From a paper:
To achieve a detailed structural analysis of an elongating disome complex, we focused on the most populous state containing a non-rotated closed PRE state as 70SL, as well as a non-rotated closed PRE state as 70SQ. Local refinements of 70SL and 70SQ resulted in reconstructions of 3.09 Å and 3.3 Å resolution, respectively. In line with the corresponding population of total 70S (closed non-rotated PRE), 70SQ is in a post-attack state after peptide bond formation with peptidyl-tRNA in the A-site and deacylated tRNA in the P-site. Due to the obstruction of the 70SQ factor binding site, binding of the elongation factors EF-Tu and EF-G is forestalled. 70SQ are therefore locked in PRE or POST states, respectively. In contrast, bL9Q is found in the compact conformation with its CTD bound to uL2Q, bS6Q, and 23S rRNAQ H79. Interestingly, while bS1Q is present in the disome complex, bS1L is not resolved. To further investigate bS1Q in the context of the present disome complex, we low-pass filtered the 70SQ map and docked an AlphaFold224 generated model of bS1 into it. The filtered density readily accommodates the two N-terminal bS1 domains and extends further towards the putative location of bS1 domain 3. Comparing our structure with the VemP-stalled and SmrB bound E. coli disome, we find that the bS1Q NTD of the functional disome occupies the proposed binding site of the SmrB N-terminal helix.
Residue numbers in the entry:
A (entry chain l): 1 to 46
B (entry chain p): 1 to 18
C (entry chain w): 1 to 93
D (entry chain b): 2 to 272
RNA sequence: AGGACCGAACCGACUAAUGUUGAAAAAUUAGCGGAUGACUUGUGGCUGGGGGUGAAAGGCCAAUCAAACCGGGAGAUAGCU
RNA sequence: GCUCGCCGGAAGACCAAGGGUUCCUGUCCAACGUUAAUCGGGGCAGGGUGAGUCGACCCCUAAGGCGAGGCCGAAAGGCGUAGUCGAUGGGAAACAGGUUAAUAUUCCUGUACUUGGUGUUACUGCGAAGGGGGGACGGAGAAGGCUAUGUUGGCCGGGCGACGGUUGUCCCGGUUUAAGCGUGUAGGCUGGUUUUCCAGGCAAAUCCGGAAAAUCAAGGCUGAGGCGUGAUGACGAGGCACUACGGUGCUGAAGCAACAAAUGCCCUGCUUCCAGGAAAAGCCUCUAAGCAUCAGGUAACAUCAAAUCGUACCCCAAACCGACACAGGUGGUCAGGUAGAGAAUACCAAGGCGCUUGAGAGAACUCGGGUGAAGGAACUAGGCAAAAUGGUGCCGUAACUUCGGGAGAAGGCACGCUGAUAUGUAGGUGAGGUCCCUCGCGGAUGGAGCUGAAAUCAGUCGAAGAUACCAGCUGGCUGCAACUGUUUAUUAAAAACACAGCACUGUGCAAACACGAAAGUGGACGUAUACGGUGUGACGCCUGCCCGGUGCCGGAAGGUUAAU
């Protein structure tokens, strides 16, 4: 049966990519939180 | 060499009303 | 393409595979490892000047590095660019 | 002509079509076309602000000359074309200098007729004149409210207004709603009735026809749950609540007009 | 001509059996309904939580919904176990 | 390696998305594989994707996003103009053959094509952020002309049959060739050519659109396909020699015609219908300002340049989404033979596989099946289930009806094979030949040769001729909903929801209303023959009385009454 995750790189980058996150301050606050936590992968972009 | 565990659980049965 | 300084860093190493050996015998084409950022043009100029040989055409491809493991640690080989440089008929290296 | 189809299949039994052989069967005049993207009844916030809108066949908009300011230039009707954006039919007119435009087709208009606009035009169907120069009691349509703004009143098929009186710079008009209204005498109007008067005789006949018009199904509030609509539901079919609207405003009689800026022009409201 | 007929692809999911620590966190087999249309589908897009969307079942909104998810107030409070 | 079995509108082949080295070779068997494993999509080490013409990218825009200034908003921010992004759409160009363990429209051979830059030469009105044309568009249906492709015959090569016959009307295989270039065919569309005038196309315009007049019986545009060329080539059954079972090298016959035939092409056509069916740029053309010696334009040569990025492999699956090497899910392209209406179905071709434990035994019981004496729903909440019906042609077909239906109503008859009518029928296709041509891919005759139903009569076997697979059970009364449709993804598909229709009511357009602190947007680029809300729910006959209560509408004299 069709599961929930149907991958698509273009949709994936346009939704959660670095430039989509940084477009707004709230997304920029996500980067600030992940930088503070020390995440190896900041965003979903490859 | 990297085993793990997972459990979600589901709920269903019959009636107990008499 | 015209600067002698740029050209001297374009060629990295020759390729010594079985395919390269066949290229020497059959179609007079040399397989080289070049800088990842290099363009077909400049490569033609560098080989023509540093080897005194006439080049017909140069086709390039990008080899993706392999993912390996050193013990229990993940790792990746570097990407590199492979150039197939076809020499004009008669000339040999 | 109004023709009823024989009931050779359910969904065709009650369809009644209005067929006018005089309408042009070819393609529209290309230079007058522009995109008209659908909205789905959704505003710039993306929310539905008017329900029961969505889908339907794609339609292109025809630029209709609602101003009629080519004064003194006679025009001849080349053909009548169907317009999906309105119930009335439109007329492609050709002026004597070569200009083409789309106009509303009045009742008696036909190919080869001659129309004229301006203060010195004759009072004849299809002619546009300032309404100060039209005899009282005449029947007109596509009536402008403000000088140069364009016609806005009585534009749908078969509609018209009556000039019942003239007094100084104002006239009193009886609109299709029956209200008597004052409009500036310098406003223009087109003589005659709007064509396609048989439009009320058509029967679409089936749900698919309304879907072709971009009309989505309407669900009665009494069929909903209390969380969704004030009429809510209840076991079986229960009502017991003075009629309302999806947002609590009382329907079935409560008046909602509150302008205070245009009432000065209403000498008698409709009844 | 047809929200026409029959019936594959395709969409749907009415009956029964099997499955119920499954082949499977809703399936398979034999049947069944629609099948030029209010059809179906690909790729993008828009609507965000007392809000959305809903041919309306309190349905759906990432195996979740009479108020999603994540973090915080927070060691809420718990005359109860 | 030889058999056997399964799929073959897939369980084959090629892709997109997604994955990311799983691809190929060597080597190894700890772990991984639901068993062993010498094997593997496992471990290790090397190798492997080559693009002016394939995509991405680039130019162009859709929905939509962002958005200088701007408008709005406690702040954050929201909306939005000019703009700038954004394909799932529009824009220049490559084909065949060969070759690697793994790549190939990317590599070699052969033969092509496109767009720019530069130079030379000749002839020369050019030129926009402007204007026009074009690009440019729906659904359904009907044929006709074609090709892919198949069949048969001919031709070429091989064969004379592990047991009856097989020099024969016999058996097997092959009979292949592209883009490009030339011709412009079937056919579709449109009257054409000059001169003249003109408040229009934001100015101008020689263009477009107009008015008149003249003259021509034609001209132009589009477009399949075929044919020729490409091609004295390539490919080609097979052959002999060598050799590491590979292979390598050389040679290499015929390479035609008829018929049938698409869901593919002419066709973005034609016809018809209402629900009335993108944009922009490239491209063509027209002139402004600014140059008119110049620049620039056109044409012919020569010449440069066409970068960068993807390119292995899987892709209905063991490589993607499902924790699994999970009986699930996943868009596009390709469409062989016999039977058949068919992409159903059965058996097969090319090709790919036998589903990662098996071996015995042949108990109960369970699952999936097969058959059944006599009876035939007595079973059972309930004919659930199972069984039965099932095709084509023809005959025949009721109440009722909105005259369409009901209806495939029910019910019945005939179906194989052989011969004859007729050594293949009617039909379809149509060569040669013979006339005619202002002459060609021509027209008219002509009928050879191929292809081919269907019927009747006679005979003939079977217990059964729609013999398998495939493939309606039917009828009567009645409740409910008119109908098609929608719904509780995952215990409810209904009488529930929707529905056309009907009525009431609001709404005069800075509309009502709705989303928004607001700007604004939707309603609608609509205007009462319109839109919103409510209830009812085709159609037919109809919808009685009550305004006291509660709402709503109208009135405004009086009583009462806030801030002030
Ligand atoms: Mg490349
Ligand atoms: Mg409505
Ligand atoms: Mg209604
Ligand atoms: Mg309910
Ligand atoms: Mg709600
Ligand atoms: Mg409520
Ligand atoms: Mg009740
Ligand atoms: Mg139907
Ligand atoms: Mg049916
Ligand atoms: Mg099945
Ligand atoms: Mg079916
Ligand atoms: Mg059906
Ligand atoms: Mg859920
Ligand atoms: Mg709450
Ligand atoms: Mg606690
Ligand atoms: Mg606290
Ligand atoms: Mg088989
Ligand atoms: Mg087949
Ligand atoms: Mg099949
Ligand atoms: Mg990929
Ligand atoms: Mg690996
Ligand atoms: Mg392998
Ligand atoms: Mg093991
Ligand atoms: Mg491996
Ligand atoms: Mg700003
Ligand atoms: Mg595309
Ligand atoms: Mg090359
Ligand atoms: Mg052929
Ligand atoms: Mg013998
Ligand atoms: Mg079709
Ligand atoms: Mg490949
Ligand atoms: Mg391969
Ligand atoms: Mg699987
Ligand atoms: Mg398995
Ligand atoms: Mg047994
Ligand atoms: Mg028996
Ligand atoms: Mg037996
Ligand atoms: Mg018995
Ligand atoms: Mg018996
Ligand atoms: Mg009985
Ligand atoms: Mg009993
Ligand atoms: Mg009984
Ligand atoms: Mg039953
Ligand atoms: Mg059965
Ligand atoms: Mg059946
Ligand atoms: Mg009863
Ligand atoms: Mg129903
Ligand atoms: Mg009823
Ligand atoms: Mg739906
Ligand atoms: Mg359910
Ligand atoms: Mg459903
Ligand atoms: Mg169900
Ligand atoms: Mg009802
Ligand atoms: Mg009553």
């Amino acid at each position: 049966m069709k599961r929930t995750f149907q991958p698509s790189v273009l949709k994936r980058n346009r939704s959660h990519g670095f430039r989509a996150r940084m477009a707004t301050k709230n997304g920029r606050q996500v980067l600030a939180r992940r930088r503070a936590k020390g995440r190896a992968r900041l965003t979903v972009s490859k | 060499x990297x085993x793990x565990x997972x459990x979600x659980x589901x709920x269903x049965x019959t009636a107990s009303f008499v | 393409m015209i600067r002698e300084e740029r050209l001297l860093k374009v060629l990295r190493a020759p390729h010594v595979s079985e395919k390269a050996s066949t290229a020497m015998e059959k179609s007079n084409t040399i397989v080289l490892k070049v800088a990842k950022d290099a363009t077909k043009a400049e490569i033609k100029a560098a080989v023509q000047k540093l080897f005194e040989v006439e080049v017909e055409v140069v086709n390039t491809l990008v080899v993706k590095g392999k993912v390996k493991r050193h013990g229990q640690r993940i790792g990746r080989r570097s990407d590199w660019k492979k150039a197939y440089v076809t020499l004009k008929e008669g000339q040999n290296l | 002509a109004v023709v009823k189809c024989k009931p050779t299949s359910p969904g065709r039994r009650h369809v009644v079509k209005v067929v006018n052989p005089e309408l042009h069967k070819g393609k529209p005049f290309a230079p007058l076309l522009e995109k008209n993207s659908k909205s789905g009844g959704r505003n710039n916030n993306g929310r539905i602000t008017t329900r029961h809108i969505g889908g339907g066949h794609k339609q292109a908009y025809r630029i209709v000359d609602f101003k009629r300011n080519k004064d003194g230039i006679p025009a001849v009707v080349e053909r009548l074309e169907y317009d999906p954006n309105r119930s009335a039919n439109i007329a492609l007119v050709l002026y004597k200098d070569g200009e083409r435009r789309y106009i509303l087709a009045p009742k008696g208009l036909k190919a080869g007729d001659q129309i004229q606009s301006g203060v010195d035009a004759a009072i004849k169907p299809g002619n546009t004149l300032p309404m100060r120069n039209i005899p009282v009691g005449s029947t007109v349509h596509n009536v402008e409210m403000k000088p140069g703004k364009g016609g806005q009143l009585a534009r749908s098929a078969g509609t018209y207004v009556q000039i019942v009186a003239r007094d100084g710079a104002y006239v009193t008009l009886r609109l299709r709603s029956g209200e008597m209204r004052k409009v500036e005498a310098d406003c223009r109007a087109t003589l005659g009735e709007v064509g396609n008067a048989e439009h009320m005789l058509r029967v679409l006949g089936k749900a698919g026809a309304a879907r072709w018009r971009g009309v989505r199904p309407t669900v009665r509030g009494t069929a909903m749950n209390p969380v969704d609509h004030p009429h809510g539901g209840g076991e079986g079919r229960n009502f017991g609540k003075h009629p309302v609207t999806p947002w609590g405003v009382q329907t079935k009689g409560k008046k909602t007009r509150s302008n205070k800026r245009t009432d000065k022009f209403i000498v008698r409201r409709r009844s």
